[model samples]
Every structure is written in structure tokens, then in C-alpha cells.
Target chain A: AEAESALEYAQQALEKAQLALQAARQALKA
Target chain B: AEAESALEYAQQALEKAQLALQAARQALKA
Candidate 1:
């Protein structure tokens, strides 16, 4: 369930992080 | 390829969280 082999999980996490950061930045701008 | 790395990246993404559940929860929350 939790392993490095999980590329999709990693990528998703990265995507989520990137999104969160974007959201945070947007919030800051707002 | 998917859930694994997502866990891995999610594992790696946030250095700190309010709670451990906050970690996984935040990933989902994000």
C-alpha cells in the first residue's frame, strides 16, 4: 500500500502538493 | 505504480503536519 514502487501515488502527491501551493499562493494574492 | 508512489510522495511531500493522520488526511484534504 505504501511503497516507492507506487509511481502514481508519488505523482499524485506531487500534483496535490503543487496544487496546494498554488492555492496557498492564490489565497495570499487574494 | 500508482497508489504506492502517491503514498511515497505524500509521505515525502510535507515535512511536518499537525498530526500523523493529518499527513494522510491532509493529502486527501489537499
Candidate 2:
């Protein structure tokens, strides 16, 4: 299941990036 | 201030989310 479709991986990567962005913003205030 | 890594990033995000709660003794003191 690790080898997901391109679209699935893209979506997951987007989510991961979003989470990373959110984390970055929070880090500034912390 | 970036390149915090997969651990620090997670910690900061959680801290920020908790700050919104307004119940902690210190919010962004970290």
C-alpha cells in the first residue's frame, strides 16, 4: 500500500505540506 | 528559525493550538 497512485501521493503530499506550513507559522510565535 | 525537524515542528503546532484554548499558565512563553 506504500506505492499509492500518483494522485493519491500528490494529495498526501499536499496534506503533509499544509501540515508543515501550519507548523512553521506556529513555530514563529513559539 | 526553520529546519526545526519532524519533532520540533509538531511540538510548536500543538503549542499554538493549545494557546487558543486560553486555559494554560503560559501560552507563547516558549
Candidate 3:
């Protein structure tokens, strides 16, 4: 049960991070 | 600029967290 919760949070964090990468890349395009 | 450099490091931390998140999720799934 605890692991299941951990997994849920992990997925959320991963998605949040991926956004930063794209944002970073776009910001560097200048 | 220093801001840009800081952003670069943030970018790395975000990516690293992303990987950890994925691993945590997979382990949880089991």
C-alpha cells in the first residue's frame, strides 16, 4: 500500500520534471 | 548570465529526480 502511494507521487514528479526540460530547451533557443 | 547557469543546474536536478521517480514507480508497481 505504501509502495503504491510512492509510485503515484513518483509519476507526478516525473511529469513535472519533463516539463522543465522542454521549457529549458525552449528558453535556450534564443 | 548567472541566471542561465543556475537554470542549467536546475535542469539537471529536475532530470535526475525524474529518473529516480521512474525507478520508484516501477519498484512500487511490484
Candidate 4:
């Protein structure tokens, strides 16, 4: 269950990090 | 370079997590 939970937590973190990274890239272009 | 590098790091981590998660699910089914 720990692995399962870890994936879930990482998934959430990745999702947020993806959004943040996308925004950061766009800001760089702007 | 921070955002770019950060994204790459997370992408690698997510890929590993995906594999791990898949393995865990398979084990659960077995």
C-alpha cells in the first residue's frame, strides 16, 4: 500500500509541477 | 535552465513511478 500511496502522492506532485513548469516556460517566452 | 531541468527530472521520476505503480497493481492482482 505504501507504493500505491507513494505513486498517488507523486502523481499529484507531478501534475502540479507540470502546470508550474508550463507556466514558467511561457513566462520565459513572454 | 532551472525549469527545463526540473521538468526533465520530474519526467524521469514520473516514468519510474509509472512502472512501479504498474508492477504494484499486477502484484495485487496476482
Model 3 CAPRI rating = acceptable
Segments in model 2 whose C-alpha atoms lie over 4 Å from true places: A1-4, B1-30
Q: Can you give the DockQ of every candidate in the order shown?
A: 0.07, 0.04, 0.39, 0.32
TM-score of 2: 0.43
Candidate 4, B1-30: lDDT as tens digits: 776777667667766766776677668667
Could you tell me which residue pairs clash in candidate 1? Answer: A6-B4, A6-B5, A7-B1, A8-B1, A8-B2, A9-B2, A9-B5, A9-B6, A10-B5, A10-B6
lDDT of 1 by residue, B1-30 (tens): 443444444445643322333445545654
Better of 2 and 4 by lDDT: 4
lDDT of 1 at A18: 65
Ranking by DockQ: 3, 4, 1, 2
Global fold similarity of model 1 (TM-score): 0.42
Each model's TM-score?
A: 0.42, 0.43, 0.60, 0.52
lDDT (Cα, tens digit) per residue for candidate 4, span A5-30: 76577767757766776677677667
Task: Report the lDDT tens digits of candidate 1 across residue range A1-30.
Answer: 433324445565566766566555555555
**RMSD (CA, angstroms), candidate 1:** 13.2
On DockQ, the candidate that comes out on top is 3
